[PDB]
């Protein structure tokens, strides 16, 4: 068994959306290049479902994209597009379907969430959030979907919402201490970790952890550097922060969170500097 890191698209060195796809193997501690996605995509999302990498939404420098494309872990091909053009949307997996909420279509931010079923190749609309959010994070915790942070066109948000499938509505939970947009969101053990982001004035290195059991927020040792629009994932039980913008330059860094000694250390760096790129973890 081995778990690989995948980084797709984003905003590159040359101040442009990019199509680059990189793979990190921790066993070899080595980076590899994969076939590039068919379209340059910044503000993009990415998920893993049945050994498939899904690149969702984004912004190609001209339009924000309905299109979604897939790679079987190789060749990249398009699948059924979303009902909404979504840039900077939250994406996650639940059961064996893909959930994508929020985003920006070029004129309005979205309360919508939708669901991709691969067995019928379909995107289905579901219940709307209370607040439209772009740059918000999506995660699954105890079989329930959480969407955190973002930006509604007016203020940066500390609001966190949770989805109730039995009613089709979202209910608010205890908000985060710091309003964050472009923060990385992941689930590690019994805590939802939110890393970095932007609070309206400063680029954040702060990290918060929400306890699934107690429903309470805590502050954690902050990352080695400020990161906004940084990827966050869990690989073989360790939390990883991926690239991002440090307030002045794009980042190559990938850093790991050590829970036993409670510290962050940069573990590796990619061949490209990216922010708001899609991140996913795939099991080999």
């Amino acid at each position: 068994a081995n778990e690989v890191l995948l980084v797709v698209g984003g905003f590159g060195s040359q101040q442009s959306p990019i199509d680059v796809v990189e793979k990190y193997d921790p066993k070899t501690q080595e980076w590899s290049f994969l076939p590039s996605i068919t379209r340059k995509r910044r503000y993009v999302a990415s998920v893993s479902l049945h050994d498939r990498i899904y690149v969702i939404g984004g912004y190609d420098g001209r339009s924000r994209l309905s299109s979604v494309e897939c790679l079987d872990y190789g060749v990249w091909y398009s699948v059924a597009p979303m009902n909404v053009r979504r840039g900077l949307a939250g994406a996650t997996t639940l059961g064996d379907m893909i959930y994508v909420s929020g985003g920006f279509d070029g004129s309005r931010r979205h309360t919508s969430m939708e669901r991709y079923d691969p067995n019928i190749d379909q995107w289905s609309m579901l219940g709307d959030m209370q607040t439209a959010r772009e740059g918000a994070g999506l995660v699954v915790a105890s079989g329930v979907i959480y969407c955190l942070g973002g930006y509604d066109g007016l203020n940066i948000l500390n609001s966190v919402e949770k989805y109730d499938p039995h009613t089709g509505h979202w209910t608010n939970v205890t908000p985060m201490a710091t309003k964050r947009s472009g923060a990385g969101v992941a689930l590690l053990n019994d805590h939802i970790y939110v890393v970095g982001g932007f609070d309206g004035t400063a680029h954040l290195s702060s990290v918060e952890a929400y306890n699934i059991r107690t429903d309470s927020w805590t502050t954690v040792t902050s990352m080695t550097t400020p990161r906004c629009y940084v990827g966050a994932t869990v690989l073989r039980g360790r939390l990883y922060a991926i690239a991002g913008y440090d307030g002045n330059s794009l980042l190559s860094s990938i850093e790991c969170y050590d829970p036993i000694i409670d510290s962050w250390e940069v573990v590796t760096s990619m061949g490209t500097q990216r922010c708001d790129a899609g991140v996913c973890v795939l099991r080999e």
Partner: peptide
Amino acid sequence: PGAPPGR
């Protein structure tokens, strides 16, 4: 969106 660089 927040602090994301623009093009």
